[PDB]
A paper describes a structure:
Here, we have determined the structure and molecular architecture of the Ty3 capsid by 3D and 2D cryo-electron microscopy (cryo-EM) and compared it with those of the retroviruses. In the case of Ty3, Gag3 is cleaved into CA and NC domains. Formation of the capsid is important for genome protection and is an essential step in the retroelement life cycle. Similar to retroviruses, the protruding capsomers of the Ty3 capsid are formed by the CA-NTD, while the inner layer, linking the capsomers together, is formed by the CA-CTD.
Adjacent CA-NTD domains exist in different orientations; therefore, we considered a pair of CA-NTDs [one in orientation A (cyan) and one in orientation B (dark blue)] to be the repeating unit, and aligned and averaged the four independent copies of this pair of CA-NTDs (excluding the CA-NTDs from the fivefold position). In this way, we generated a higher resolution 5.5-Å map of the CA-NTDs. We flexibly fit the homology model of the Ty3 CA-NTD into the new EM map. The N-terminal 36 amino acids of the CA-NTD do not have a defined secondary structure in the homology model; however, in our map, we resolve density corresponding to this region. This density runs outwards along the interface between helix 1 and helix 2 of the CA-NTD in the middle of the threefold (and fivefold) position for ∼60 Å (cyan and blue densities). In orientation B, this density continues over the top of the CA-NTD and down the interface of helix 3 of one CA-NTD and helix 1 of the neighboring CA-NTD on the outer side of the threefold position (blue density). The total length of the density in orientation B in the EM map is ∼100 Å and likely accommodates all 36 amino acids. In conformation A, the N-terminal half of the density is not visible; it is not bound to the rest of the CA-NTD and is probably disordered.
Author numbering:
A (entry chain A), B (entry chain B): 37 to 110
Write the structure that this text describes.
């Protein structure tokens, strides 16, 4: 799953890369529109645990990167 | 089937949650665009049985929740 989800990080950053942004808030809420079924539950809780309106865009990805935890064998 | 369909309730409410709505009518007709093959037949009949244009958004879900009827054994 996560090996696909590692790639799933890559293009969605690359998609919003070439397009502009008027601010930072709508960028971080754009991701959850594409996210998976149990991950969006974590994604919903993660904004509510943030007391401020936004912790910056990479930090949302790193918690999803910390959601990965997957090494292979060989 | 329905154990998946219980989850299928959850995100589609959560998807439209963070997005706005100008009214209530287009929200209830958005669901049937994703619904299953025999369920959309029930979904088509359910609006026609409503004499008024809309009975509110949860009531459509509860009839789908009443469509479930599935307990497990252990």
């Amino acid at each position: 799953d996560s090996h696909k989800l590692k790639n799933f990080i890559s293009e969605i950053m690359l998609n919003m890369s070439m397009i502009s942004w008027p601010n930072d808030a709508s960028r971080i809420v754009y991701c959850r529109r594409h996210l998976l079924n149990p991950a969006a539950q974590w994604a919903n809780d993660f904004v509510q645990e943030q007391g401020i309106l936004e912790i910056t865009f990479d930090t949302f990805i790193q918690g999803l990167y910390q959601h990965f935890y997957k090494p292979p064998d060989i």
